[PDB]
């Protein structure tokens, strides 16, 4: 039988509801004491918090996919066991499965899923108008933000590129620098003489004001809109944009919320710790993160229930979840110079400061400033 001294780390909002589940948890594995306490710095901050002293660190700590490259690259957590890679497949949607998968071999323990969608006032649009990016922008402004690489980068997926490649892990597979490339380029250029596209760098602001009648943002704020637009709330997934003279789905990225063991935690708790993080993200666990929440299971059975599937958000969410709507944002260490030249290379394009006749040029710059070995 299980036993052992584990400390959890979890976010914000989240530490009550999973001793709840923890008391689910201590019923089968009464022997293993759970500390449930806050991660310092957040979910967002793992790979950090875990990393300034591995040793002090939780034995189990939420985290993200795009950090479990870095995380297991520093040796903070172990592969799974295939018997335990043989349940997390077995039981959820395989984007989670690949989103926690890092050279082949799995390194985390999925239970949520994330993607922005489109959130908008349905007293100023309505859904068969947003289901066209030009459509939506020729009746409402959309509010949105070009300095946002998260934003907008994906539309460069939805051009039929890729980013380090199909799996996401190959060092010089971006080949935006291309003929494609240049079409989300000129698709970013287009946007600021668009009448419907406001830069705002605060778009809940101009929702809130109303001088927007749509906004992009993922299933962290949905509560929040919600308040702000109240009866006018409408959430829908990203729409179809115009790109080689055909509508393709705009993409957005996906992240796969999860738990690790810290590798570098007392050994003899080391089975405990395992144990616990198969638990918490089994499928009772995430309706009852659902419950309380609102975050999106990725258990397929649980994806299932009424619950959910009245969820709107939900819907668009888990719609945008599909393969061709969206991409797992990348595990590379390589994306920390991405995340600091996406952003000039988006919005120098809407603003123009890059002009068509460079983005052949600043293309190339570009993979080669994100692909060095």
Same mark, same amino acid.
């Given at each position: 039988?299980?036993?052992?001294?584990?400390?959890?780390?979890?976010?914000?909002?989240?530490? *009550? +509801?999973?001793?709840?589940?923890?008391?689910?948890?201590?019923?089968? +594995?009464?022997?293993?004491?759970?500390?449930?306490?806050?991660?310092?710095?957040?979910?967002?901050?793992?790979?950090?918090?875990?990393?300034?002293?591995?040793?002090?660190?939780?034995?189990?700590?939420?985290?993200?996919?795009?950090?479990?490259?870095?995380?297991?690259?520093? $040796?903070?957590?172990?592969?799974?066991?295939?018997?335990? =890679?043989?349940?997390?497949?077995?039981?959820?949607?395989?984007?989670?499965?690949?989103?926690?998968?890092?050279?082949?071999?799995?390194?985390? +323990?999925?239970?949520?899923? !994330?993607?922005?969608?489109?959130?908008?006032?349905?007293?100023?649009?309505?859904?068969?108008? @947003?289901?066209?990016?030009? %459509?939506?922008?020729?009746? %409402?402004?959309?509010?949105?933000?070009?300095?946002?690489?998260?934003?907008?980068?994906?539309?460069?997926?939805?051009?039929?590129?890729?980013?380090?490649?199909?799996?996401?892990?190959? @060092?010089?597979?971006?080949?935006?620098? &291309?003929?494609?490339?240049?079409?989300?380029?000129?698709?970013?250029?287009?946007?600021?003489?668009? #009448?419907?596209?406001?830069?705002? &760098?605060?778009?809940?602001? !101009?929702?809130?004001?109303?001088?927007?009648?749509?906004?992009?943002?993922?299933?962290?704020?949905?509560?929040?809109?919600?308040?702000?637009?109240?009866?006018?709330?409408?959430?829908? *997934?990203?729409?179809?944009?115009?790109?080689?003279? #055909?509508?393709?789905?705009?993409?957005?990225?996906?992240?796969?919320? =999860?738990?690790? @063991?810290?590798?570098?935690?007392? $050994?003899?708790?080391?089975?405990?710790?395992?144990?616990?993080?198969?638990?918490? =993200?089994? #499928?009772?666990?995430?309706?009852? @993160? +659902?419950?309380?929440? $609102?975050?999106?299971?990725?258990?397929?059975?649980? !994806? #299932?229930? &009424?619950?959910?599937?009245?969820?709107?958000?939900? $819907?668009?969410?888990?719609?945008?979840?599909?393969?061709?709507?969206?991409?797992?944002?990348?595990?590379?260490? !390589?994306?920390?110079?991405?995340?600091?030249?996406?952003?000039?290379?988006?919005?120098?394009?809407?603003?123009?400061?890059?002009?068509?006749?460079?983005?052949?040029?600043?293309?190339?710059?570009?993979?080669?400033?994100?692909?060095?070995?």
């Amino acid at each position: 039988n299980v036993s052992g001294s584990v400390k959890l780390w979890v976010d914000t909002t989240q530490v *009550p +509801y999973y001793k709840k589940i923890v008391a689910n948890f201590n019923k089968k +594995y009464p022997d293993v004491k759970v500390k449930v306490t806050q991660s310092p710095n957040g979910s967002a901050n793992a790979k950090t918090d875990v990393g300034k002293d591995p040793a002090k660190a939780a034995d189990v700590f939420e985290v993200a996919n795009d950090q479990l490259g870095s995380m297991a690259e520093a $040796g903070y957590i172990n592969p799974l066991s295939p018997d335990a =890679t043989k349940a997390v497949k077995n039981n959820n949607v395989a984007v989670a499965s690949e989103g926690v998968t890092w050279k082949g071999k799995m390194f985390a +323990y999925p239970f949520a899923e !994330q993607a922005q969608t489109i959130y908008y006032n349905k007293s100023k649009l309505t859904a068969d108008d @947003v289901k066209t990016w030009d %459509g939506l922008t020729a009746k %409402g402004v959309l509010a949105t933000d070009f300095t946002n690489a998260y934003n907008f980068y994906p539309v460069f997926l939805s051009a039929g590129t890729q980013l380090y490649g199909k799996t996401g892990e190959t @060092v010089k597979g971006t080949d935006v620098n &291309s003929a494609k490339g240049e079409q989300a380029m000129a698709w970013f250029a287009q946007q600021k003489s668009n #009448k419907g596209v406001m830069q705002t &760098s605060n778009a809940l602001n !101009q929702l809130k004001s109303g001088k927007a009648a749509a906004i992009l943002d993922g299933p962290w704020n949905s509560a929040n809109i919600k308040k702000i637009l109240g009866k006018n709330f409408a959430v829908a *997934p990203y729409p179809t944009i115009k790109l080689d003279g #055909k509508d393709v789905q705009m993409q957005a990225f996906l992240g796969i919320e =999860t738990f690790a @063991v810290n590798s570098h935690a007392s $050994g003899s708790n080391q089975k405990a710790a395992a144990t616990l993080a198969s638990f918490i =993200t089994n #499928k009772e666990s995430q309706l009852i @993160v +659902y419950d309380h929440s $609102g975050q999106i299971p990725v258990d397929k059975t649980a !994806q #299932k229930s &009424s619950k959910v599937a009245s969820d709107p958000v939900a $819907g668009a969410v888990m719609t945008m979840a599909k393969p061709g709507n969206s991409t797992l944002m990348p595990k590379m260490p !390589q994306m920390a110079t991405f995340w600091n030249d996406a952003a000039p290379l988006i919005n120098g394009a809407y603003t123009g400061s890059i002009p068509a006749s460079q983005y052949s040029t600043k293309l190339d710059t570009f993979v080669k400033n994100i692909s060095k070995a």
